[PDB]
A paper describes a structure:
Trp50 in the active site of KE07 is a convenient spectroscopic handle to interrogate the active site environment (a second tryptophan residue, Trp156, is invariant throughout evolution). A Trp50Ala mutation was made in KE07 R1 to assess the contribution of Trp50 to the fluorescence; the crystal structures showed no major changes to the active site nor overall fold. This showed that the overall fluorescence of the R1 Trp50Ala mutant was slightly lower than R1, which is consistent with some quenching of the fluorescence of Trp156 by Trp50, similar to what has been reported previously. The Trp50Ala mutants in R1 and R7-2 result in significant (>95%) reductions in kcat, although the KM of R7-2_Trp50Ala increased sevenfold, whereas the KM of R1_Trp50Ala was unchanged, suggesting more involvement of Trp50 in substrate binding in the evolved configuration C.
Computational design of KE07 involved construction of a theozyme to catalyze the chemical reaction, which was then grafted into the scaffold of imidazole glycerol phosphate synthase (HisF) from Thermotoga maritima. Catalytically essential residues from the initial design include a base (Glu101) that facilitates C−H bond cleavage, an H-bond donor (Lys222) to stabilize the phenoxide intermediate, and a π-stacking residue (Trp50), which was designed to stabilize the transition state and favor substrate binding through interactions with the aromatic ring of the substrate. This initial KE07 design (Round 1; R1) catalyzes the cleavage of 5-nitrobenzisoxazole, with 103-fold rate acceleration over the noncatalyzed reaction and a turnover rate (kcat) of 0.018 s−1.
Numbering used by the authors: 2 to 250
Amino acid sequence: LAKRIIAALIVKDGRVVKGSNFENLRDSGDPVELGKFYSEIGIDELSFADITASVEKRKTMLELVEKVAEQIDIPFTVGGGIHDFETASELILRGADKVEINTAAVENPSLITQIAQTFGSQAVVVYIAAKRVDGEFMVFTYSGKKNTGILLRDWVVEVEKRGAGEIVLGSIDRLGTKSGYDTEMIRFVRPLTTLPIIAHGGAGKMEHFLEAFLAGADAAKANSVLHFREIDVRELKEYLKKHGVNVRL
C-alpha cells in the first residue's frame, strides 16, 4: 500500500550504458557500485536491463546478478532477452529476486506460469509495452517494433491469470520524453488487475510521480532522470510524503 521508487539501469557487457553523474563513486559506469549507492540513498528496488551481444549475453547476465547479489540487499529485477524457463531459473538461483519478461511471455504465456510454479508469482515481472493505435491500447513486442494486435485490456487480464507478480506498464508514446507518465494508460489498467502496477516511461520532474501514484501506480520505474540527477531520490520521497504519498522514509 506503500509506493516504491525503482531505479532502472540499462547495462551492456557489465557496464552502465551512458553511465551516471555521481562523481562520488570510483566508477560512475559500474552498475554494481551505482546500484549499491542507489540502495544507500533510498532506492526501493533495482531493475537491470541487459543489452549485451547475444553471444556473451547469458554468461554476462549471470556474471552481473552474482556481482550485484554480493553487494546489495533491496530486491532487484534482471531482464532483457530472457526467453525460457531455464534462463530465468539460473538468473534467480544466481542472485536475482525477480526476472522481467516481455516478448517471450507474449509469444508463450505459459512461460509466466512455469517460472511462477518454481519461484513464486513474486519473482515474475511482466513488461507490457503499450501504445495507442486507432484509439485502442495495443501491446507491442520486439522493443517496440511489432504491434501484436493484442489489446492491453486482454493481455493485462491474461498476465494475472497466468500468475505474474507485478506488471511494468510502459507507455511507448512517453518513453524517453520527460513529459510525465501516461496517467491515462495507468487509469485504464488500474481496475483491470489486482496486481502491482509499476509505471515506466515519461518521468521528468517530481510531480509526475505524484500524478502517477494518484493515477493508481504502486511503483515508479525511473531511468536517466535518476542517473543524471535531474531528480534526487531523497528530495523525491520528501516531496511525495509531504503531499500525502505513502512512501517509506
